[PDB]
Design a protein around this ligand. Structure first.
Ligand SMILES: CC[C@H](C)CCC(=O)[C@@H](C)[C@H]1C(=O)C[C@H]2[C@@H]3CC=C4C[C@@H](O)CC[C@]4(C)[C@H]3CC[C@]12C
Length: 431
């Protein structure tokens, strides 16, 4: 059918009614084929680094050049501040990838494949047009299925730029079928010895009633640096109706203390994360223009060469059935994929290959670990940056501060950490 028929179709109305009895498990939503995406959530990890030059720019900023790596302020006060600006522009540059790519490729946000446990998605940006970049590697692993959790690392050994993080959600519908989504997890970015802690924002999915879903961001994201500098980014959907969307204001502070007072911002950035934004130092200059720089997608090896744990190969028949809009064959291929994976895990275990906690481990940060649980080393980055920001260290929604209501709920404190050795010693998977 034409998208203009979607909203009043029997399938759509049937799906909307089924939401009334929503069990809280999104996996269950029996979404019609036309609103299904053939991309797994393990691929979404790639959206952290689709502008290789912006990902890597902080590593090129040093005591001896920083005033030459700060396009909107050649008079920036410090290399630390220049780097905070660049990491902020990078983080803004991810949002269009993360929150808009299905709209442009499929014509609307669609319901992604729920990843199997142990599912892997790997690739690299080889950065051939820029020798000084080197290859940047993405590893993405499905570390939990009940509930779904994706962990990931993106690293550039040449420039000592490395990213790790993990993600999970909780969602519920309101009466008009808006879907409120709270993200959980965080991502850490190290630029040589300097670190940055990033928290993803809450969001809501609009347009379900009309069968044309889309994301809009709300609340706040933070970027807290080991330098003490902090960026607080606030999202809003003001001006819908006037055709405005995807707005934000980001303010960078000397430290989290100054951040409790807006008038102390060293810079204020505002605009649209999916279009353009300006910056004003404590008149204005263009900070980022998402239309001027296309996304660059990572290199993924051919399907014929992929290991059967790899997302695209693994989801291949299911994807083909979705593309064909065949309810029958989608139900069949899915049941087949479950049998494949069940048998594959058996073989992995038979060869003594660990498939479960493949490249990431769950660390317990609660002051009551289970006897031999994995626990963080003493100068752990996460603890020190969470403390500078007064971030709760528990499994609260991303961005929860100490003493917020959500920080008060006997909540756990388990966080996923990448183990590089595990990739170096990886038994099967290559790029
Ligand atoms: C009723 C189904 C509706 C058609 C869509 C509901 C649905 O598919 C939800 C689960 C889906 C979306 O609608 C948008 C997805 C988020 C998009 C972007 C990202 C960023 C990434 O770093 C982490 C994953 C996340 C948060 C997606 C999670 C699943 C959502 C909410």
């Amino acid at each position: 059918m034409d998208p203009s028929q979607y909203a009043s179709s029997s399938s759509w109305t049937s799906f909307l009614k089924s939401i009334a009895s929503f069990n809280g498990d999104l996996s269950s939503l029996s979404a019609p084929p036309f609103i299904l995406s053939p991309i797994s959530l393990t691929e979404f990890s790639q959206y952290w680094a689709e502008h290789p030059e912006l990902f890597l720019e902080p590593s090129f900023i040093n005591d001896d050049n920083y005033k030459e790596h700060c396009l909107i302020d050649p008079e920036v006060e410090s290399p630390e501040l220049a780097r905070m600006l660049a990491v902020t522009k990078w983080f803004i540059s991810t949002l269009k990838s993360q929150y808009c790519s299905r709209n442009e490729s499929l014509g609307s946000e669609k319901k992604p494949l729920n990843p199997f446990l142990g599912e892997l998605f790997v690739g690299k940006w080889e950065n051939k047009e820029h020798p000084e970049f080197g290859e940047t590697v993405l590893l993405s692993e499905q570390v939990s299925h009940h509930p779904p959790v994706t962990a990931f690392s993106i690293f550039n050994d040449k420039n000592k730029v490395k990213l790790q993080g993990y993600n999970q959600i909780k969602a519920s519908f309101t009466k008009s079928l808006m879907l409120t989504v709270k993200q959980f997890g965080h991502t850490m970015l190290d630029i040589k010895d300097e670190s940055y802690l990033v928290t993803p924002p809450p969001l809501h999915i609009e347009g379900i009633l009309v069968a044309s879903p889309f994301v809009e961001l709300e609340g706040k994201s933070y970027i807290q640096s080991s330098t003490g500098l902090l960026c607080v980014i606030e999202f809003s959907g003001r001006g819908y109706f006037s055709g405005k969307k995807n707005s934000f204001k980001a303010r960078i502070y000397k430290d989290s203390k100054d951040s409790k007072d807006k008038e102390k911002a060293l810079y204020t950035i505002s605009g649209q994360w999916s279009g353009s934004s300006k910056i004003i130092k404590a008149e204005s200059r263009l900070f980022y223009d998402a239309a001027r720089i296309p996304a660059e997608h990572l290199n993924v090896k051919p399907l014929e060469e992929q290991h059967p744990l790899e997302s695209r190969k693994a989801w291949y028949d299911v994807a083909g059935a979705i593309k064909l809009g065949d309810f029958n064959l989608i139900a069949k291929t899915k049941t087949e994929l479950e049998e494949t994976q069940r048998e594959l895990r058996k073989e992995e275990e038979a060869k003594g290959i660990s498939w479960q906690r493949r490249w990431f481990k769950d660390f317990d940060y609660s002051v009551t670990p289970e006897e031999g649980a994995l626990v963080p080393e003493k100068d752990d980055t996460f603890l020190k940056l969470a403390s500078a920001l007064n971030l709760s260290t528990k499994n609260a929604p991303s961005g929860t501060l100490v003493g917020d209501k959500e920080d008060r709920k006997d909540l756990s404190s388990i966080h996923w950490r990448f183990q590089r050795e595990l990739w170096d010693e990886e038994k099967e998977i290559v790029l």
